Design an enzyme around this catalytic site. Structure first.
Site, PDB file in Angstrom:
ATOM      1  N   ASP A 134       1.062  -1.668   0.366  1.00 32.67           N
ATOM      2  CA  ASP A 134       0.067  -0.005  -0.306  1.00 32.67           C
ATOM      3  C   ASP A 134       0.591   1.316   0.224  1.00 32.67           C
ATOM      4  O   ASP A 134       0.861   2.161   0.234  1.00 32.67           O
ATOM      5  CB  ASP A 134      -1.178  -0.047   0.836  1.00 32.67           C
ATOM      6  N   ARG A 138       0.116   9.057   0.572  1.00 33.67           N
ATOM      7  CA  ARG A 138      -1.438   9.190   2.114  1.00 33.67           C
ATOM      8  C   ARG A 138      -0.727   7.845   3.167  1.00 33.67           C
ATOM      9  O   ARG A 138      -0.907   7.858   4.528  1.00 33.67           O
ATOM     10  CB  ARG A 138      -2.490   8.070   2.099  1.00 33.67           C
ATOM     11  N   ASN A 139       0.467   7.639   2.480  1.00 34.76           N
ATOM     12  CA  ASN A 139       1.146   6.008   4.120  1.00 34.76           C
ATOM     13  C   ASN A 139       2.474   6.511   3.587  1.00 34.76           C
ATOM     14  O   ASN A 139       2.741   5.990   4.798  1.00 34.76           O
ATOM     15  CB  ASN A 139       0.645   4.753   3.502  1.00 34.76           C
ATOM     16  N   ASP A 152       2.890   2.861   8.580  1.00 34.53           N
ATOM     17  CA  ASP A 152       1.282   1.641   7.178  1.00 34.53           C
ATOM     18  C   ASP A 152       1.518   0.200   6.932  1.00 34.53           C
ATOM     19  O   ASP A 152       1.978  -0.580   6.230  1.00 34.53           O
ATOM     20  CB  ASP A 152       0.098   2.367   6.619  1.00 34.53           C
TER      21      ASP A 152
HETATM   22  C1  8ZN Z   1       0.071   5.971  16.652  1.00 31.40           C
HETATM   23  C2  8ZN Z   1       1.018   5.105  15.321  1.00 31.40           C
HETATM   24  C3  8ZN Z   1       0.389   3.127  15.644  1.00 31.40           C
HETATM   25  C4  8ZN Z   1       0.926   2.566  14.427  1.00 31.40           C
HETATM   26  C5  8ZN Z   1       1.237   2.937  13.450  1.00 31.40           C
HETATM   27  C6  8ZN Z   1       1.537   4.751  13.362  1.00 31.40           C
HETATM   28 CL1  8ZN Z   1       2.724   4.891  12.030  1.00 31.40          CL
HETATM   29  C7  8ZN Z   1       2.266   5.194  14.648  1.00 31.40           C
HETATM   30  N1  8ZN Z   1       1.794   6.429  14.436  1.00 31.40           N
HETATM   31  C8  8ZN Z   1       1.169   7.373  13.069  1.00 31.40           C
HETATM   32  O1  8ZN Z   1       0.724   7.184  13.298  1.00 31.40           O
HETATM   33  C9  8ZN Z   1       1.318   8.671  13.519  1.00 31.40           C
HETATM   34  C10 8ZN Z   1       2.838   9.391  13.987  1.00 31.40           C
HETATM   35  N2  8ZN Z   1       2.827  10.688  13.730  1.00 31.40           N
HETATM   36  C11 8ZN Z   1       1.721  11.255  12.534  1.00 31.40           C
HETATM   37  N3  8ZN Z   1       1.474  12.874  12.520  1.00 31.40           N
HETATM   38  C12 8ZN Z   1       0.422  12.884  12.066  1.00 31.40           C
HETATM   39  C13 8ZN Z   1      -0.003  14.292  12.526  1.00 31.40           C
HETATM   40  C14 8ZN Z   1      -0.836  14.732  12.362  1.00 31.40           C
HETATM   41  C15 8ZN Z   1      -1.334  16.235  12.699  1.00 31.40           C
HETATM   42  O2  8ZN Z   1      -2.214  16.482  13.761  1.00 31.40           O
HETATM   43  N4  8ZN Z   1      -0.856  17.074  12.104  1.00 31.40           N
HETATM   44  C16 8ZN Z   1       0.106  18.344  11.609  1.00 31.40           C
HETATM   45  C17 8ZN Z   1      -0.725  19.837  12.255  1.00 31.40           C
HETATM   46  C18 8ZN Z   1      -1.860  19.698  11.204  1.00 31.40           C
HETATM   47  N5  8ZN Z   1      -1.375  19.999   9.872  1.00 31.40           N
HETATM   48  C19 8ZN Z   1      -1.552  18.763   8.966  1.00 31.40           C
HETATM   49  C20 8ZN Z   1      -0.817  17.868   9.691  1.00 31.40           C
HETATM   50  C21 8ZN Z   1      -2.256  14.206  11.632  1.00 31.40           C
HETATM   51  C22 8ZN Z   1      -1.588  13.214  10.466  1.00 31.40           C
HETATM   52  C23 8ZN Z   1      -2.837  12.322  10.031  1.00 31.40           C
HETATM   53  F1  8ZN Z   1      -3.601  12.976   9.612  1.00 31.40           F
HETATM   54  F2  8ZN Z   1      -2.455  11.757   9.602  1.00 31.40           F
HETATM   55  F3  8ZN Z   1      -3.113  11.337  10.939  1.00 31.40           F
HETATM   56  C24 8ZN Z   1      -0.761  12.661  10.968  1.00 31.40           C
HETATM   57  S1  8ZN Z   1       0.207   9.739  13.073  1.00 31.40           S
END
Ligand code: 8ZN
Length: 291
Positions: A134, A138-139, A152
């Site tokens: 994937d 977006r990932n 992801d």
């Molecule tokens: C926690 C975790 C578990 C398993 C796998 C993974 Cl890859 C993760 N880690 C994450 O998902 C993330 C790590 N950093 C992240 N940053 C992030 C940050 C934001 C976000 O709040 N802030 C930025 C601030 C506002 N402007 C756009 C983006 C948004 C996202 C999204 F929408 F995509 F979800 C992601 S998400």
């Protein structure tokens, strides 16, 4: 896997959500050191065995990796409920939305550097015998140093959880516009199908997050690809970069570059940055004529 006590985790803001948990921005206390920002994903009570296996399985996979361009795991809460996965926090979020919100704001060299980082993470994964399935903007996640990291991970959960992955006539659930023909046609996912996807990501980056194939339907995308058509050059795209994305889209899997070849080429272009000044011709859709 590092087990983190819940008293060390402060969830501060929901940044993503689903039916069975949420993703939060928060802080992690790791007595002497300052708390550190983290992302936190939860799995709420009532989860099934399969949900637990898939949820913790993503953490298990991530814990096997140590690379600059792969999201880093801080640890898990598994001894208490709700369970959590805690990772580094990527301040700029998902690459697709980031580019669309920053249209035209970067130099060509910056864009190519983003692709180099993605390619290095993918080379690492492919060498580790991990097929992503994937790969798409977006990932990818982006930090405050502009570093792009592949996100992801998992087995069935990756395509199951992605709404861009749609059910096909054959019964599989795949993100058509990003997926190589052999993966669409007969379910053959390999690092070489990830290379096809990477070519799509290159196009996403160089267009600041345009939707691949624009409004063509999924059936129409497959028909065009099988007929030999390919995405046209982005505007302002280095010729070398368009040539490379075209090589990623070879029908014959064996003809595609490996990630090692992609990293090598991108490295060399960045080290001789004048090489990026030669642009592929762009095919205009609209004529503006003035006397
Ligand atoms: C926690 C975790 C578990 C398993 C796998 C993974 Cl890859 C993760 N880690 C994450 O998902 C993330 C790590 N950093 C992240 N940053 C992030 C940050 C934001 C976000 O709040 N802030 C930025 C601030 C506002 N402007 C756009 C983006 C948004 C996202 C999204 F929408 F995509 F979800 C992601 S998400």
């Amino acid at each position: 896997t590092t087990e983190i006590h819940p008293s060390c985790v402060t969830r501060q803001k929901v940044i993503g959500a689903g039916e069975f948990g949420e993703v939060y921005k928060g802080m992690l206390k790791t007595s002497g050191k300052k708390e550190v920002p983290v992302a936190i994903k939860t799995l709420k009570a009532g989860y099934t065995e399969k949900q637990r296996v898939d949820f913790l399985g993503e953490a298990g996979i991530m814990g096997q990796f140590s690379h600059h361009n792969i999201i880093r795991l801080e640890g898990v809460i598994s001894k208490y409920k709700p369970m959590m996965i805690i990772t580094e926090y990527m301040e700029n979020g998902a690459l697709d939305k980031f580019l669309r919100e920053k249209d035209g704001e970067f130099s060509v060299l910056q864009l190519v550097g983003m692709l180099r980082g993605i390619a290095a993470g993918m080379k690492y994964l492919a060498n580790m015998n991990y097929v992503h399935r994937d790969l798409a903007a977006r990932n990818i996640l982006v930090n405050s140093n502009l570093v792009c990291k592949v996100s992801d991970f998992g087995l069935s959960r990756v395509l199951e959880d992605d709404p861009e992955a749609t059910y096909t006539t054959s019964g599989g659930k795949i993100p058509i516009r990003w997926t190589a023909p052999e993966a669409i046609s007969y379910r053959k996912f390999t690092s070489a199908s990830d290379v096809w996807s990477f070519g799509i990501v290159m196009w996403e980056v160089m267009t600041y997050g345009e939707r691949p194939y624009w409004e063509l339907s999924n059936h129409e995308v497959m028909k065009a690809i099988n007929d030999g058509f390919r995405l046209p050059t982005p505007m302002d795209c280095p010729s070398a970069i368009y040539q490379l994305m075209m090589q990623c889209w070879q029908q014959e899997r064996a003809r595609r570059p490996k990630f090692a070849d992609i990293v090598s080429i991108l490295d060399k272009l960045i080290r001789a940055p004048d090489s990026l000044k030669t642009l592929a011709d762009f095919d205009p859709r609209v004529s503006i004529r003035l006397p």
